[PDB]
Each structure stands twice: as structure tokens, then as C-alpha cells.
Design a protein around this nucleic acid. Structure first.
Ligand SMILES: [Mg+2]
Ligand SMILES: [Mg+2]
Ligand SMILES: [Mg+2]
Ligand SMILES: [Mg+2]
Ligand SMILES: [Mg+2]
Ligand SMILES: [Mg+2]
Ligand SMILES: [Mg+2]
Ligand SMILES: [Mg+2]
Ligand SMILES: [Mg+2]
Ligand SMILES: [Mg+2]
Ligand SMILES: [Mg+2]
Ligand SMILES: [Mg+2]
Ligand SMILES: [Mg+2]
Ligand SMILES: [Mg+2]
Ligand SMILES: [Mg+2]
Ligand SMILES: [Mg+2]
Ligand SMILES: [Mg+2]
Ligand SMILES: [Mg+2]
Ligand SMILES: [Mg+2]
Ligand SMILES: [Mg+2]
Ligand SMILES: [Mg+2]
Ligand SMILES: [Mg+2]
Ligand SMILES: [Mg+2]
Ligand SMILES: [Mg+2]
Ligand SMILES: [Mg+2]
Ligand SMILES: [Mg+2]
Ligand SMILES: [Mg+2]
Ligand SMILES: [Mg+2]
Ligand SMILES: [Mg+2]
Ligand SMILES: [Mg+2]
Ligand SMILES: [Mg+2]
Ligand SMILES: [Mg+2]
Ligand SMILES: [Mg+2]
Ligand SMILES: [Mg+2]
Ligand SMILES: [Mg+2]
Ligand SMILES: [Mg+2]
Ligand SMILES: [Mg+2]
Ligand SMILES: [Mg+2]
Ligand SMILES: [Mg+2]
Ligand SMILES: [Mg+2]
Ligand SMILES: [Mg+2]
Ligand SMILES: [Mg+2]
Ligand SMILES: [Mg+2]
Ligand SMILES: [Mg+2]
Ligand SMILES: [Mg+2]
Ligand SMILES: [Mg+2]
Ligand SMILES: [Mg+2]
Ligand SMILES: [Mg+2]
Ligand SMILES: [Mg+2]
Ligand SMILES: [Mg+2]
Ligand SMILES: [Mg+2]
Ligand SMILES: [Mg+2]
Ligand SMILES: [Zn+2]
Lengths: 66, 63, 97
RNA sequence: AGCUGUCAACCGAGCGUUGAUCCGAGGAUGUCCGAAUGGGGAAACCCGGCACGAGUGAUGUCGUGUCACCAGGCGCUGAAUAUAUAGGCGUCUGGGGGGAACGCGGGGAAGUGAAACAUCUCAGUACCCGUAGGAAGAGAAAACAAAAUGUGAUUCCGUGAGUAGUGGCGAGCGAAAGCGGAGGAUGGCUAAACCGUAUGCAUGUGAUACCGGGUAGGGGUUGUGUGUGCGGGGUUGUGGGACCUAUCUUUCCGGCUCUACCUGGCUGGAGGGCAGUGAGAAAAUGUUGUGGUUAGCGGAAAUGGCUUGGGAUGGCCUGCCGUAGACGGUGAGAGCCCGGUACGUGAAAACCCGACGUCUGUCUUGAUGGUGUUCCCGAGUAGCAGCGGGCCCGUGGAAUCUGCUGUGAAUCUGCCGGGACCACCCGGUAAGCCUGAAUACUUCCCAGUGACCGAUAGCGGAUUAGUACCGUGAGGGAAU
RNA sequence: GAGUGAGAAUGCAGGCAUGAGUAGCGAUUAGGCAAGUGAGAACCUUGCCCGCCGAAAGACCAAGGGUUCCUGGGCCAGGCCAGUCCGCCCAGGGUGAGUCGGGACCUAAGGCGAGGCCGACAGGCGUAGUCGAUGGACAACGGGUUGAUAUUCCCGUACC
RNA sequence: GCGAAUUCGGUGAUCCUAUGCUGCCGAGAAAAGCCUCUAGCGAGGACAUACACGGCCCGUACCCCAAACCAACACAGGUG
């Protein structure tokens, strides 16, 4: 739901805030699926990829590639 | 006791040969001698295994 | 970057008849990361759910072996955490009841 | 323009012309074990130190770094003990393990053959140990040769030749010279004599010394032995080189060498050449090449008729393309239906090959004679002896090469080779080093081929295959 | 141009005969009846009897095994017969510790072993160390509860 | 869900006192732990009571003289 272009616009601290937010959303989704009340299975994959994106961007800024 | 610590002289391998010409493997060991060698004039000695050739050539020294 | 979160430890709730019977007693069962220990789980649970944890009990469970035409395969092993909440603490609304 | 790997569907949800899936290149992440290396351990699981950060009321807890051992630089310290050294701290840089074959150097069987067997064979094979490299080893004559006005580093291939020979002269084993080819580098750099300089260890307070005359001054220990390092000089067999000592020729500017004057040095900086990452010194860094590799894209011509058939790609009959009639696929033999094919075309990035620069070296006075009981020309070396190894060569009249153990020379009238040895001639110049190409091999990757196999065949393995299963283990090992 | 001809090698692989509807169906205790379930019952379930073990054929562990445990389902393979049953097949569930048994404590035999000594190479031993229980040290007992765990959960009372 | 009585004796351990005691010759682990001693740390420190808290990792199902372990078998064997 968020693209690498938009992520590169946020400050370092805003990215870390978004990473916590996504981890909380993933946690809620896992519980909803264990309870069997989650209709859209695909939200798990998308949230997980969103976490991976934020990590990638953060690492690029440390390595000086951005 | 078959390897010199200065020049690396190792044993040679060959054959002992009987009168009946039976060839059996044997070694030719270097003649290496324990020497209490020194490093500087009037210094502490250190035991090393030097071949007689190195002793004769003066590559080890004593005090 | 590494941004550790308490929710990384607590993978899923356990849904079963025994688990519900424990929820009646204010005791909740979670699947947790195999490497986690009781103290880590206590800290994580109280941070996530903003609740006082009384005790945490744990148990390792070996995965079942199942036959196939292809041969024997093994399900994953898991670690369970039986978490008792302090008396006087708000119940957890996420197990689905 | 369709996708969410597959056995493998079924359900449940979603993405994509705002370019998904997919393909290539470069990054990010990369739990635990494993050389495994913080410590420990029954490999993949147990327990920590220190630093920073997070979290607690605090303890507990959680991140992220870092902490093995050995070898070699650099710094501190210097036990018994004085000089010191061993060692101990600290810090930087490495090594460790794996890999199918091919290389090099070491160690080294037996079955077997001899119709027995020990010499001999098998065989320097199998196996083992130490190390490589993309190839390796070898290599620039102390070589061959035989009086030819010879050849001219090494390696590899063909011959010479199953010959000369060797051999319980049994079974067997078996050259080299010479000649024809592959490759091109008949390639390079060093040690000494003798100058200069630095400095270690002895001396010396006077001669000496301060480039050398003829001097004129001056300065005063700057000296004098010997060792080592770094620059000049020297790289050779018709011997060569150092040292002397005539001759003829030579860019410019310095600066120095106690003072000028001659005059030697040595050393900078300008003109100019001559080489370069290679063996011949080392590490960089730009620009540029429709040069190459790692994705691809285009690409001619039949919906043709009639007949058979479930289906035409069959039969019969027309036409077309062809730089394309390779090979597949498609409902049965397809150049014209599809993937392609001939032929063209294409690279942001990374990598590889060049060219060109920078940049780095190096050189810049050479030619020419004479001269000599002068110096130098790789020492525990050559030689010799004992016992072995290996050479066609099994100790033989046994050279050449080589290990161990003794003994132990000459620097050119020298020394070593021309199959014992001696003489005479000839060849060469040992005991320092480096070196491309021709040659060997294929774990792996790409493109192809077969009078090769076609499911008891072909790999053990077309099917979960080194799996099931067997064995404590090494190891053995299917079937579909 | 040949992997070119099989009847035999106590030949090899696969399929299948003969013996034969034969021998066996694995102890030394033994089963019977009624009712039930079911398409089907000598073997499954329940009741009432009979019999057997009782220093065991009862109860609890270590080693070893690995889900065989519990609930529901299954019944063409397996069970030496049959099977509605099963230690077999399928799905889901189930193992809760400051005190129990181990580690984070300690050492024994022995193992490995920094340096080290020895040994052509490969390696052989071993010091300081560090591992290694079958031993040493160290704090919890009774009751209740689930279909399946309990000195672990809960109750009561303790201890480090 | 409710729930009585629960006294006295006898017998008697291979279990406990006991790592005891007595006897004997073959003469019978180690280390930690605990206690104590100083050395050396020290300006703060010891003890008691109350309250609030931390107490990690592995095993825990089931079989275990057996058709669930070793025996190719639902095997008259073996198993501390
Ligand atoms: Mg030899
Ligand atoms: Mg022999
Ligand atoms: Mg991460
Ligand atoms: Mg508890
Ligand atoms: Mg536990
Ligand atoms: Mg099953
Ligand atoms: Mg380790
Ligand atoms: Mg270790
Ligand atoms: Mg001293
Ligand atoms: Mg290696
Ligand atoms: Mg014979
Ligand atoms: Mg014979
Ligand atoms: Mg080489
Ligand atoms: Mg002959
Ligand atoms: Mg020199
Ligand atoms: Mg000559
Ligand atoms: Mg046709
Ligand atoms: Mg074709
Ligand atoms: Mg010479
Ligand atoms: Mg010989
Ligand atoms: Mg000679
Ligand atoms: Mg060489
Ligand atoms: Mg067939
Ligand atoms: Mg096959
Ligand atoms: Mg065996
Ligand atoms: Mg096995
Ligand atoms: Mg045949
Ligand atoms: Mg036949
Ligand atoms: Mg037959
Ligand atoms: Mg029959
Ligand atoms: Mg009969
Ligand atoms: Mg009968
Ligand atoms: Mg019978
Ligand atoms: Mg029976
Ligand atoms: Mg009946
Ligand atoms: Mg019966
Ligand atoms: Mg009885
Ligand atoms: Mg059961
Ligand atoms: Mg069952
Ligand atoms: Mg049932
Ligand atoms: Mg049946
Ligand atoms: Mg049956
Ligand atoms: Mg020991
Ligand atoms: Mg040892
Ligand atoms: Mg060692
Ligand atoms: Mg231990
Ligand atoms: Mg024990
Ligand atoms: Mg039970
Ligand atoms: Mg009462
Ligand atoms: Mg139990
Ligand atoms: Mg069995
Ligand atoms: Mg039995
Ligand atoms: Zn020597």
C-alpha cells in the first residue's frame, strides 16, 4: 500500500514509526487468521513486504546509497 | 633427531642390498648433534639440533 | 537497522477446547518464537497488552510425523506459552472467545 | 498481457497497460551448524565477558558490535641476573578449510609374470604425504658433436627402434645422438675486483684527513683497521671485467665537494630520446572502440481447391517464398499454421579485451687503442673415498647425474665435460636468480553432434535415488 | 557396419507351476450365557458367572522407542481366521515446575589439550587448562481437578 | 449435595537412629560446598520487621519383563 518512492520521502524517524505501525498491523492480522475471522488473506503478504521495504530504505541510508 | 634446525637437512631413503641382492628399504639419517648454541657474545644458551655439517661450517656458536 | 518489537515473539493464539477452558480462568495460551524464554515473554505480553502478568509457563512440542506416498514428513515443532494474568486485570479481547 | 514455483488440483483471497508474472545485471537482508574462531558440546544446542543502546521500581530480560590459536611487522617492558635474553603486555597484517581432473616434490605394496621361487617382473603402478597454478615443471650451455669452416635455451609431437644394448643373457626390459615438425624471447637480471656513502664493532688525539696534481693558503682529528647495508662499476668464453695509461669525438643551466686555478667526481633542474605493468621496476587514473560476455527483438511465402478421415500435416491438382527445404510443435509425412531458421539488429549496468593519454620509470660521452709474475670472476663448493638411488646400463672395465657419512682444492698456466684411465685436441665456463609461447586436464557454464542406448537397455538413479532398505560403523544399495 | 541367433553355465531378472487346498495358524490360564451394536459377530460393547497371575501376568521408573497417548471417524492393505475391534489407516487435540530429573555447581576413570617435548612428512605423547556421572553439594508436602498433564494446573500449608 | 465413629491393645520389618557401634585385614575417590584465619578491600555498614517484586534453559504425552525396547515376525529368548 506504500511504494518505495513515497518511503524515500520520509525522515529517518518517520520510517521507524511506520515500521512499528506495520509490525502491529501484522500482529493483529496473525491473530485474526488464527481466530479464522480474516477474509483477505493477501493482506498478510502485503504487510510483510511493506516491512521489508522500510528496512531496505533504512539500510540504504546508512550505507550512504541515498 | 633426523632433521637439522638450521639447514633443514633431512634423511635420505634408499636400499640395503643383500649378498643375494635382496633390496630392503632403509634410511640415511643426517648426523645431527645436540648443541647448546648461543646468539650473541656471552649470552644465554639454547639447545638446538644442528647437523655436524653446520657445526663444522661455524653456523652454530658456543660460550 | 534492527527494530525489535515485543510482537515479534508472540506469533499466534492457541485455539482449542483446553485453551478456552483456561481463558475462563483468565489464562491465555500463545504460540511463541522457539528461542524465547519465560522472562522475555512476560515482558513482551505486559508491554503489548498493557496488563500485569502473574506467571508464564512454557512447553516445547515436537512436530508430528505424517506419511505420504513420497514418504515420511515432519511438521514444525513449536513452543507454547501459558500466560496467567494477574487477578484484577482486564481480559484480553483477541482470542475470539 | 496475463499472473500468485512445482508434485497438484481443490477451495480461499488478490494483484497487472499508472507495465504485473517472467528474463539479465548490480545491491540489501542472509537464524543455527560447519575451518568454526568468546567458552563448552553428543554438528545444527548449551553458557558467558566487555562496549554502546533499549527495557524494568530494581533484579531478571532484549538489540547491535566485539572477544580463538598460530606466524610475521611495529611499540612498551626485560625474570632467575649484571650485560642482557626467554617471556609478558599492546596493536596491525596474514594464515587455517573445501574442490572432478591435470602439475611438481617426497614415501611406496601385493595379487600377478617367470608354468615353482628369492635376483628380476608387476611398477615407481595402487595407495599415501607435502604443495601448487590456470596450467605446472623445465629453460638461456661448466650442452651436444667429431675434426664437418658443424649445431646453438627449454618444453612437446613424429622418427631413429622393439634397434644399440640391457637381462637368474631367464621371464623380460629398452635408450640417445641425428633428422622432420609445433613455438617464437639464439630472452633477461644479479655475486665479486674497484670507487662513493651510511652505520655497527675495535682503536687513535698523533701522523692522518679534507677528489687529484703543481701549489699557495687554511682547517685541526674530521682519522685508522674490519664487518654490514644502500648507490656507481661489472655481466663474459675468440676469455671477460676491474685497475692502470695514450687518442679522437662530444646539449643547456645550475649546485656541491675548505680557498682560489686547473681538474676529477657526485648530484638537482630544463631540451630531447627509449621503455612500462611483463621475465626484463611499482601502484595507480581519465577518455575512447558497432570490440567481446551476461537479457533479447525483427524476420519471406497457401484460411488454396477436390478426395479420405474424428482430425490432413495423407493422396490428387494448382500457386507462392527461398541469403530461409536446420530441428521441433500443431488432432496422421508442413519451406508457406506455430516456436523458429537464413539474415539482420540491440545494452542502462557490471565484467573482459584493447587503443589513447595522463602517470611511473630509465637514459643522455661516447668511441678508440696500448699495458701487466696486478686484482676479480658464486667454498665446506668442486674433487676424492664409503654405502645407496637413478641412468639402455641388475656393480659391471662403469663414465655422466644424485642422497647420506667422512675428507677436502684451485680464480684462467684455473676448473669441468667429450663412457674406466692418461696424454693431446675440441666444447663449455659449475657451486646466484627470473622467464611468455608450443604441451596436460574439465567439478562447472554455453552451443552442438552420433551407421550411440531406448525402460532387465542407457548413469546405481527417465519414477521422492545415493532415496527406500541393509549394517554398530566404514560401507552396501534397489524397484516403479 | 554389428551389443547378429541360447536349452542347458547348482547362470541373472520378472512372471508362474509342482508339492496342496497339504503342513502350520507360536505355549505350559478357559471360557460360557444373556442383551446390544451392525450388511455381516466364537473373537467388538455391556451385564451376570467361570477360570488364571498375585516377589506378578499388579504398581512406578531409567535405557530405548517416537505420537504408539486422548476424542471423532474409518474398515479392499496389515492382524497367521473373521472383525463393527486394534498397538493398523485418517483428521483434530493433548506434555504447564524457583523445589521433581539434568544444565547454568563439583569433581572420578577417561577424553581433548594453549604453549611444549618427541617424530623424515603423516603424526605420538603430554603440562597449564578444559570437559566428563555411575558419585559429592543443593529449596515441597498433602488434597482436588481434564477425554488426554500434574510434587508442574488449582486449593491448603511450606521452604530456598 | 449431605456425611457417623475415629478409642485402646497386639504383632512387627530387608525401613529409620546408622556416614552409628563392635570386630577384622585385603586397610577402604576427588573437587566443589560449608566453617575459620589472616592478606587485602573499606565510609559507610550490620541486623530485624512490613510491603512490593525477579526466579532462566532442557525433559515431562504414552509403552517400559513388553505385540510400543534388543530379537527380520503382534517371535515360549533377552532387559538395570
Ligand atoms: Mg628412492
Ligand atoms: Mg620386490
Ligand atoms: Mg533483521
Ligand atoms: Mg507456576
Ligand atoms: Mg518446563
Ligand atoms: Mg497415522
Ligand atoms: Mg564455538
Ligand atoms: Mg572447542
Ligand atoms: Mg637484566
Ligand atoms: Mg589450502
Ligand atoms: Mg610364478
Ligand atoms: Mg601358474
Ligand atoms: Mg614456472
Ligand atoms: Mg639387442
Ligand atoms: Mg654492490
Ligand atoms: Mg673457447
Ligand atoms: Mg496435404
Ligand atoms: Mg521437419
Ligand atoms: Mg663461475
Ligand atoms: Mg643404480
Ligand atoms: Mg670425464
Ligand atoms: Mg625456476
Ligand atoms: Mg517394453
Ligand atoms: Mg536402469
Ligand atoms: Mg558387519
Ligand atoms: Mg541404521
Ligand atoms: Mg548377443
Ligand atoms: Mg530363453
Ligand atoms: Mg533358466
Ligand atoms: Mg498349486
Ligand atoms: Mg501329502
Ligand atoms: Mg495330514
Ligand atoms: Mg494340522
Ligand atoms: Mg496364538
Ligand atoms: Mg448374540
Ligand atoms: Mg477367543
Ligand atoms: Mg490361583
Ligand atoms: Mg488408543
Ligand atoms: Mg485411537
Ligand atoms: Mg471408533
Ligand atoms: Mg479388514
Ligand atoms: Mg483378515
Ligand atoms: Mg583428567
Ligand atoms: Mg594429549
Ligand atoms: Mg599445539
Ligand atoms: Mg560438567
Ligand atoms: Mg548422577
Ligand atoms: Mg495418564
Ligand atoms: Mg469426622
Ligand atoms: Mg506420565
Ligand atoms: Mg518388533
Ligand atoms: Mg515376547
Ligand atoms: Zn644443518
Amino acid at each position: 500500500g506504500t511504494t518505495p518512492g513515497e518511503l524515500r520521502e520520509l525522515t529517518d524517524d518517520e520510517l521507524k514509526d511506520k515500521l512499528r505501525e506495520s509490525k502491529e498491523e501484522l500482529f493483529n492480522l496473525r491473530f485474526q487468521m488464527a481466530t479464522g475471522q480474516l477474509s483477505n488473506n493477501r493482506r498478510l503478504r502485503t504487510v510483510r513486504q511493506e516491512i521489508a521495504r522500510v528496512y531496505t530504505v533504512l539500510r540504504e541510508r546508512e550505507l550512504g546509497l541515498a | 633427531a633426523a632433521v637439522c634446525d638450521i639447514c633443514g637437512k633431512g634423511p635420505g631413503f634408499g636400499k640395503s642390498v643383500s649378498h643375494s641382492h635382496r633390496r630392503t628399504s632403509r634410511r640415511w639419517n643426517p648426523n645431527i648433534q645436540p648443541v647448546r648454541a648461543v646468539t650473541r657474545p656471552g649470552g644465554n644458551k639454547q639447545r638446538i639440533n644442528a647437523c655436524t655439517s653446520c657445526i663444522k661450517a661455524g653456523k652454530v656458536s658456543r660460550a | 537497522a534492527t527494530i525489535t518489537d515485543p510482537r515479534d515473539i508472540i506469533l499466534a493464539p492457541v485455539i482449542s477446547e483446553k485453551s478456552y477452558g483456561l481463558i475462563e480462568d483468565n489464562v491465555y495460551t500463545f504460540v511463541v518464537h522457539p528461542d524465547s524464554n519465560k522472562t522475555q515473554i512476560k515482558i513482551a505480553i505486559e508491554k503489548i497488552f498493557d496488563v500485569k502478568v502473574d506467571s508464564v509457563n512454557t512447553a516445547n512440542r515436537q512436530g508430528k510425523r505424517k506419511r505420504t506416498r513420497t514418504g515420511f514428513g515432519k511438521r514444525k515443532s513449536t513452543k507454547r506459552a501459558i500466560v496467567k494474568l494477574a487477578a484484577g486485570s482486564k481480559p484480553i479481547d483477541l482470542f475470539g472467545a
